[PDB]
Structure formats: structure tokens, C-alpha cells
């Protein structure tokens, strides 16, 4: 009731109370690879045969605390092993770098796209790298 | 009606086996391929009979022999037509 | 109560794991038979008319 | 600019043609992938 808090509260409710249209759901940038389901990341890393470990999902990353440090997951992911998973940000940065450096020129990117789209329902078709 | 349609189907089967043998070859083992009378039917005459009834009994011996000496080019045509006569003869059975 | 929910946690894990494995087996053997059928369908030289 | 349309159709037909020609050794690869997936799930 002081001509500042009024519009403050007004903006708050005008920004948090809407009709939840699916047309307003906040969508992430295409270049930020951390917002990619962590199975896209693993399939990318596994397809281009990169050299990274797998990531810690979110349950394995909050599982790290003095109390959480006694669970089988911590003691299987933090001792001396080779399967030692990592934080999603690291794998996502490796993937992003191999994305911005390895490059492509069309004349083979498009016809492959068309052959892919026109055969979605087919089980027996050209695997474009496998 | 039932006899004619069942015989046409069984001959379709035998001709399909042969045509599949003929498709995957080299273009010179085709030209010299010959099948003896009978083809593997222990009661062979049926197929000839069928083919007669499909074309006629005048212009049917000509074809029955033309695929006895050129099974490579003249039995993807005798088969594409048995596969019309099966469909048509079953619809005729229904309509009557 | 904490003993009971400990048991519940471990039973739920066991359930989800065995579902995982049976489902992956079924999916691979599905894809196999679909590959078989789409292979033989490229072998037809004269199709059916209708 | 129909040359671009001709290029693209030629390439896509090329992909179809290559797959149909190699269609017999591009089918044991599928089945070895599948058999190893099966024996490794087991």
C-alpha cells in the first residue's frame, strides 16, 4: 500500500498465476547440452566413441554427503575403479566441444535426413553409421 | 468350383517356388535352365490342366511348351496371371 | 516403522530390476522377427492383386 | 535450379540402391548384433 510493494506483488502474481498453456512451458536452448535427458548424452558419447565416463544422474549427486558416503553407490563410484561416473556438467561439456568442433557440410546431411524420415516405420534399412 | 480354385492355388505354390529359384541367379545360368515334365508334382498333369483352363485349349499348349523351354522369362508371366484368376474365381464363387 | 520401510525400499528395487531385464529381452527378440519379415518381404518378385 | 533437385534424388536413389545391393551382408550384421545382445542380456 505504498506504490512500490503494490506493483511488486502485482508482478509476482502476474508472473506466477497463468492458465497453464503448453505453449508457454519454458524451453531450453539447443546449445546447452545439460538439458538433454542424460540418455541423449550417453548415446552421443557412445556413438561418436568419445572418451568420457558416464554421468551421475541426480540421485547419485545428492547421495554425496558425510552420511551418504556410506552407501554402496558412493563406495562403488568413488574408490579406485574405471567405471567411476562423473557430474553431468563434465560429460555435457565434452559432448558440447565435440559438437562444436567436428563438422559437417550438407550434400550428405540432407539426403540422409530424407532417407531417414521416409523410413521411420522400417526395421530393415540403412544405418547411417552403425 | 472348389476343385478348380484349390488346384489353381496349389499350382501357384509350385510356380512360386520355381520363380524364386530363378530370380537369384546369374544372367547365363538362366538362359540354359530347363525343367523336366512334372516339375516335382507327383500328380503333375494338374498344373498343365490349370494353365489350359486359364488361357484356352487352343493357345494353351503353346504356352505350356513355351515355359518347358524358357522357364526364365515365361514363368513370371504365367504366375502373375494365375494370381489374377485365383482372386477372380473366388469372387465368382461368392457371387454365385 | 523404519524397519518396515527399509524392507519396502529393497523390495521395490528388486521389482524394478527384474522388470528391466525381462523388458529388454522382449524388445530385442521383437526387433529380430521384424527384421526377418522385412527381409523376406524384399524377396517377392510378383505381388498379390486384390 | 532443377540441378539441385536432380542431385538430391540421385543421392537418395543411390542410398536405396546401395542398400538393396548389399542387402545380404547388411543382414548378417543385424543378426550378429541381435545375438550378442541376447547372450549379453543373459
Amino acid at each position: 500500500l505504498t506504490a512500490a510493494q503494490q506493483q511488486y506483488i502485482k508482478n509476482l502474481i502476474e508472473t506466477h498465476i497463468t492458465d497453464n498453456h503448453p505453449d508457454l512451458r519454458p524451453k531450453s536452448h539447443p546449445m546447452d547440452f545439460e538439458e538433454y535427458t542424460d540418455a541423449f548424452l550417453r548415446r552421443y558419447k557412445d556413438h561418436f566413441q568419445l572418451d568420457v565416463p558416464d554421468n551421475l544422474t541426480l540421485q547419485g549427486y545428492l547421495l554425496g554427503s558425510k552420511l551418504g558416503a556410506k552407501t554402496y553407490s558412493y563406495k562403488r563410484n568413488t574408490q579406485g575403479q574405471h567405471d567411476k561416473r562423473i557430474h553431468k556438467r563434465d560429460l555435457a561439456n565434452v559432448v558440447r566441444r565435440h559438437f562444436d568442433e567436428h563438422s559437417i557440410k550438407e550434400t550428405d546431411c540432407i539426403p540422409q535426413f530424407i532417407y531417414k524420415v521416409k523410413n521411420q516405420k522400417k526395421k530393415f534399412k540403412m544405418e547411417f553409421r552403425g | 468350383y472348389d476343385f478348380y480354385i484349390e488346384s489353381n492355388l496349389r499350382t501357384i505354390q509350385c510356380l512360386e517356388t520355381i520363380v524364386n529359384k530363378i530370380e537369384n541367379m546369374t544372367e547365363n545360368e538362366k538362359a540354359n535352365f530347363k525343367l523336366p515334365p512334372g516339375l516335382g508334382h507327383t500328380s503333375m498333369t494338374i498344373y498343365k490342366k490349370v494353365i489350359r483352363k486359364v488361357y484356352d485349349k487352343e493357345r494353351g499348349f503353346e504356352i505350356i511348351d513355351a515355359l518347358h523351354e524358357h522357364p526364365a522369362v515365361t514363368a513370371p508371366v504365367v504366375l502373375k496371371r494365375l494370381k489374377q484368376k485365383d482372386e477372380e474365381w473366388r469372387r465368382a464363387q461368392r457371387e454365385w | 516403522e523404519t524397519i518396515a520401510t527399509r524392507t519396502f525400499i529393497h523390495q521395490d528395487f528388486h521389482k524394478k530390476v527384474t522388470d528391466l531385464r525381462a523388458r529388454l529381452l522382449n524388445r530385442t527378440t521383437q526387433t529380430w522377427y521384424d527384421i526377418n519379415k522385412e527381409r523376406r518381404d524384399m524377396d517377392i518378385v510378383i505381388p498379390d492383386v486384390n | 535450379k532443377d540441378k539441385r533437385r536432380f542431385n538430391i534424388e540421385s543421392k537418395v536413389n543411390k542410398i536405396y540402391q546401395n542398400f538393396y545391393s548389399e542387402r545380404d551382408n547388411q543382414y548378417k550384421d543385424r543378426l550378429t548384433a541381435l545375438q550378442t545382445d541376447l547372450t549379453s542380456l543373459h
Binding site: 530424407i114 | 477372380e88 469372387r91 | - | 533437385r5 538430391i8 534424388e9 537418395v12
Partner: peptide, 30 residues
């Protein structure tokens, strides 16, 4: 045109039932 109406209980079996123009056209527009 040789339409051949003769005695027929059944109809004649119908004739059984490339061309990347608008796709590459979409790519032009894009």
C-alpha cells in the same frame, strides 16, 4: 478408347496401387 463391355459377373481386377520436389522446396524456404 477400347472399352470392352462383355458378360461379366465380377469386375475387372483394378490396376494395383522419386518425386522429392516439395521436400527440397521446403529446404529452399528454410
Amino acid at each position: 478408347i477400347p472399352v470392352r463391355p462383355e458378360i461379366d459377373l465380377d469386375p475387372s481386377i483394378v490396376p494395383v496401387v522419386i518425386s522429392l520436389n516439395e521436400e527440397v522446396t521446403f529446404f529452399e524456404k528454410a
